[PDB]
Design a protein around this ligand. Sequence first.
Ligand SMILES: *C1=CC(=O)N(CCNC(=O)c2cccc(O)c2O)C1=O
Ligand SMILES: *C1=CC(=O)N(CCNC(=O)c2cccc(O)c2O)C1=O
Ligand SMILES: *C1=CC(=O)N(CCNC(=O)c2cccc(O)c2O)C1=O
Ligand SMILES: *C1=CC(=O)N(CCNC(=O)c2cccc(O)c2O)C1=O
Ligand SMILES: *C1=CC(=O)N(CCNC(=O)c2cccc(O)c2O)C1=O
Ligand SMILES: [Fe+3]
Lengths: 174, 174, 174, 174, 174
Amino acid sequence: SSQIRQNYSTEVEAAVNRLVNLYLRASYTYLSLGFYFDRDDVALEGVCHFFRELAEEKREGAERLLKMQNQRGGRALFQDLQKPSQDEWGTTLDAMKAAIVLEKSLNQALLDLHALGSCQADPHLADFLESHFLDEEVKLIKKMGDHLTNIQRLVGSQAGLGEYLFERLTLKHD
Amino acid sequence: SSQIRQNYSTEVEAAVNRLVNLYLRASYTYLSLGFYFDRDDVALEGVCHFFRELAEEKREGAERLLKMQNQRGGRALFQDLQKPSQDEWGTTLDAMKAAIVLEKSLNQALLDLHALGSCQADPHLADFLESHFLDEEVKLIKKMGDHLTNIQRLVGSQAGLGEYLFERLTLKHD
Amino acid sequence: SSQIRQNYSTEVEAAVNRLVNLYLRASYTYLSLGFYFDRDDVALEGVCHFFRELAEEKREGAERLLKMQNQRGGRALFQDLQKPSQDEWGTTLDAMKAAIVLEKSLNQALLDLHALGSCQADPHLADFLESHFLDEEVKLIKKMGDHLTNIQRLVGSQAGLGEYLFERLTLKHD
Amino acid sequence: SSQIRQNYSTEVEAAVNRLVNLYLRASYTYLSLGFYFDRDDVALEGVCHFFRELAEEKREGAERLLKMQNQRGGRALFQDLQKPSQDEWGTTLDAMKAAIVLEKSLNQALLDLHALGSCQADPHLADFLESHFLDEEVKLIKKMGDHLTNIQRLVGSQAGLGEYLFERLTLKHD
Amino acid sequence: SSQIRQNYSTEVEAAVNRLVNLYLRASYTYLSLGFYFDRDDVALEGVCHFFRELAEEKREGAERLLKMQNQRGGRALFQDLQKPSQDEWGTTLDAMKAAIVLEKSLNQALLDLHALGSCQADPHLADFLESHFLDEEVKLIKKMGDHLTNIQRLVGSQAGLGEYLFERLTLKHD
Ligand SMILES: *C1=CC(=O)N(CCNC(=O)c2cccc(O)c2O)C1=O
Ligand SMILES: *C1=CC(=O)N(CCNC(=O)c2cccc(O)c2O)C1=O
Ligand SMILES: *C1=CC(=O)N(CCNC(=O)c2cccc(O)c2O)C1=O
Ligand SMILES: *C1=CC(=O)N(CCNC(=O)c2cccc(O)c2O)C1=O
Ligand SMILES: *C1=CC(=O)N(CCNC(=O)c2cccc(O)c2O)C1=O
Ligand SMILES: [Fe+3]
């Protein structure tokens, strides 16, 4: 247990368990966003697929953190997963704004954990976040910003038409 | 005849012949919907193809019911096929609303026959409808509802443009 | 919304949202079981892999239920996901007993929802559970019972040796 | 010489030559561990192969450090390689405990050199250790801890039987 | 040097070095146009790709001119590359108008150098420009004019919608 643990502070161990909770909460928020856009009275398949893929990416991030907790000899502790902030998510524009708010809060949590790791002279934690999380988040936040600008340009004065065209011509669908 | 019939009531036999008539009427309604959208003054190929494929699916449902009538020892009886309710079907939105009304009436007829079969303790009929009809209808009704929501969002204030874009970007065409 | 909903009671809609919560809670319990057996001071890879695969199967069950909620016109509502019942799971025998208790509680919830669906004459719900859930649960519960009997026969008077051999020779590992 | 050297302190250059010595000493310790388990009166092939592969991994680490010394313009200096701490290594459990002590001392030396590099604002050294050494050591230390727990569970009251089974069923052999 | 130079005037040699500067300035202007359309608050990928490909075509033109300078025995001389005329490029319509102004100025410089070469009875220079530059520029200017007409027809009264559709349906993108 303590049989392998070396240079791994209790502060980092607890912040990693909190980061796992935040990634699994973000995966749950994306599950709810994906099934909202699969409602027959919303019916934007490309938007459903975009959020369901992010639910899987965030679960994968949590699982990588949990593998790392165990590689360093810390102990995974799970807490309840709070339900998402909304039950209905509005338009694609509202949803994409909520998603970029969620990603910036995950990014800030990564940055905060990097700072704590660097303060405690834990370079394996710092490099783990730099290699597997920080650029994934910057790439994702840039894609969401590019989508938000396109959705915004499409609203104009024909909001239904623009929402359809963005789903059909930007987002991946069957 | 009576050489194979077992646990198959006269009530179920007659309701199956009525259900065959309803499926063949729905296939005829879809034949008329498909050729209306092939008119040179309507000219929405994807909508024509969507309804012509449903005419074939409903004929196939009728043929499965007729095969089942004979597997159970009942006797297929055919009645006249009433012509469709309309000679011209309006816009894609009008047509898709008429199609979901038609499917909900077929679905209710399936549900009614399931109830009659379960009341008469005929589990082969009940499982036949559950395996081959009830989820096909729920899947189709959900696809029609998703289309209706998309067509509705596209009308807005440029109805021609929206009808074209839905046909070009949602429905399958050459 | 109500544009497609037919023969789908508010009672079934709410029980489906509760069943989704139970499946996602069982997936979370299995995530915790999988990472406990990946601890360096537990270190039973085959047991970790057995529970991590069940975490994915239970998430998949929840996602099938949510797809069905939307196919029938109900509205997915999510609640908090309660953390698992334990933070540490003991031996493989303790873990496998907790898993069969969890599966029998999911099974009973399926049976209860089947009864509610049959009472409300909702054969699409009943057949959905029969086709995609009831035999999966009976197969899984039988595999867990076969494992429990093997783990029990292996304890005898050399419990460490038996736990190792079961992991190495029954469970799938690298 | 000084023709390419830039931002590379004498302190880092000497600590890299000491780290090369520690990696080549650890490779020699593993050569001795591998041939001890190939003795006809020890005869645990999987344990021999596990340590002989680590002798090659540690030589490879030393060679990467030496390539880096030259890429940065420092000068490789070699010292004597002290013989291993033991001539006979006891049981697999004793050997695996000595190996995890050796790896934690190499890991601490990596961490110490990272700190010196970060203090002297040498990010190429810091990233070199983070990319090629720190996670390799954390992965290896976690595998050794998982093995130690399995070997410990196998001793119980039949130590010979457990040592055989671990070699046969965990470690790679012909 | 003068070892190979034949029929190659100092006037042509200096005008070729000025033409290289103009092509490398046009490549830099296109680099800036490409990265402007990759901004998250502009986000038109097809427009970014169209200008980044032109940055490479103009660098290639400069490199062909420089190879020719050396084949004829002249001496390449480089001057500073003036930064582009704008830091932000407005809409796709503004950008495409600036691009056709830039191409007509490169074309006029080609025509001027052709005239100087023909006046000095330098047919290898004249044929070099005719074979590798004059029709490339006429093809490119015609494609830009076709794009400008399409972008103009799309503005109408819904400028955002038209800018999106042109990028999605004319320009090449992922
Ligand atoms: C409080 C702990 C501490 O030392 N301090 C600085 C940690 N360093 C960084 O945050 C940092 C960020 C990016 C790259 C680096 O190399 C780096 O050291 C605190 O926050
Ligand atoms: C009148 C006949 C009868 O018994 N009664 C109930 C038939 N049962 C169902 O309709 C039903 C629906 C869905 C699943 C079941 O298992 C089921 O028994 C009548 O309608
Ligand atoms: C209360 C509602 C009701 O009618 N009742 C019976 C529902 N039927 C079943 O539970 C059942 C179970 C298995 C197969 C069947 O066909 C079936 O009808 C209630 O629980
Ligand atoms: C003495 C030199 C110095 O500045 N100090 C800190 C060096 N920083 C770290 O050790 C460190 C560890 C992990 C990630 C970082 O970004 C980081 O700066 C000393 O030890
Ligand atoms: C001043 C030099 C000169 O003679 N004069 C004419 C050069 N000729 C052309 O410009 C020309 C253009 C296109 C085809 C030709 O064959 C051609 O000679 C000057 O400009
Ligand atoms: Fe640092």
